[PDB]
């Protein structure tokens, strides 16, 4: 640690006094997990908005074929081929 | 691909022009994951409604024993035995 | 099973009559998964409230460094060291 930064943080540990072991365990779990969970939600919200706004959802339902194949069908075809999927989305790789 | 179906889809790739690599990565992640996530939510909503409406929740809380064992206790007993659990629910297998 | 407890439960299986195999599969999935999911939500709500109420969020954003390091940065440093993280939170282990 940078001692000057520790000097800012160390005093804030007093704010956790009186919490139970269970509370501190939950807090530690949260500290370890929240950043990835928040990032994934942010990215998925961005994706969902694009998918609806650009018109994709008009032909692609999650689990039923309509005008186009379901997203289940698409996901099956591109399982383990995300690089190729991105290339398809960019117009660089033809449809499978 | 069916060329006649490609003729419908290929033009829609123009709707993704101007999006960043990060946006396209999020979109691809979404395409790969959403169908399973949507199906699991749909199924879990169906299950939760049955569980409450049929009266199960009156005797079975998630993590505390009341009239009957907690769902944690039940899940422990049936861990790796979902086929047997379904048979129990149907009246075909006696309680453990 | 305790026969006296089976006598309470067995009759309630009549409440599942007329449900499809798919409905019963969803119900069994729910029975197997809900207790852990409910416990984890309860714990994470407790943690989130502590984190905000005690002032931690004023210096620790999820994915950007501000006054203090991001929670992503913290999680990286403490990956596989949750015991040490808890000890740090208690004032027992110095910062890394
Ligand atoms: C909005 C920009 C989108 C996105 C992200 C996708 N589509 Fe479509 N699509 C349609 C049809 C008839 C097909 C089958 C033909 C084919 O497979 O190319 C498709 C297919 C796809 C795929 C799979 C590509 C592959 O390798 O097979 C993907 C990833 C995909 N789409 C994404 C039909 C339509 C529409 C009907 C008018 C509209 C609108 C869209 N698609 C829009 C999008
Ligand atoms: C609503 C239809 C439900 C569902 C899906 C379940 N129950 Fe009960 N239950 C009760 C008691 C006292 C016991 C212990 C006796 C026993 O174990 O059989 C149970 C047990 C269960 C189990 C576990 C079965 C096993 O193998 O042990 C399962 C899967 C289960 N229940 C599901 C008591 C009650 C009630 C009190 C009046 C009511 C209502 C229900 N149960 C309803 C349901
Ligand atoms: C509210 C009680 C909290 C909790 C749970 C944490 N902090 Fe902070 N913190 C700050 C600075 C400048 C640093 C860097 C110095 C250092 O690393 O010690 C930190 C660091 C942490 C860590 C990492 C500990 C380590 O081993 O490096 C953890 C787990 C942590 N914090 C938790 C700055 C601040 C504040 C600015 C005034 C406030 C308020 C907090 N922190 C509050 C908390």
From TrEMBL, chains A, B, C:
Binding locations of heme c 1: 56, 60, 78, 96
Entry binding sites for heme c: 9, 56, 60
Binding site for heme c 2: 1-2, 9, 56, 59-60, 78, 96
Top-level lineage group: Bacteria
Post-translational modifications reported in the UniProt record: Binds 1 heme c group covalently per subunit.
GO molecular function: electron transfer activity; heme binding; iron ion binding
Domain Cytochrome c: 1-96
Protein keywords: Electron transport, Heme, Iron, Metal-binding, Signal, Transport
Protein name (record): Cytochrome c552
Species of the source: Aquifex aeolicus (strain VF5)
């Amino acid at each position: 640690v940078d001692p000057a930064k520790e000097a800012i943080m160390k005093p804030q540990l007093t704010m956790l006094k009186g919490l139970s072991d269970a509370e501190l365990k939950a807090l530690a779990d949260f500290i370890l997990r929240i950043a990835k969970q928040a990032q994934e939600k942010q990215q998925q919200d961005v994706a969902k908005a694009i998918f609806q706004q650009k018109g994709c959802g008009s032909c692609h339902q999650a689990n039923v074929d309509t005008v186009g194949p379901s997203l289940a069908k698409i996901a099956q075809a591109y399982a383990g081929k995300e690089d190729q999927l991105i290339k398809f989305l960019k117009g660089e790789a033809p449809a499978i």
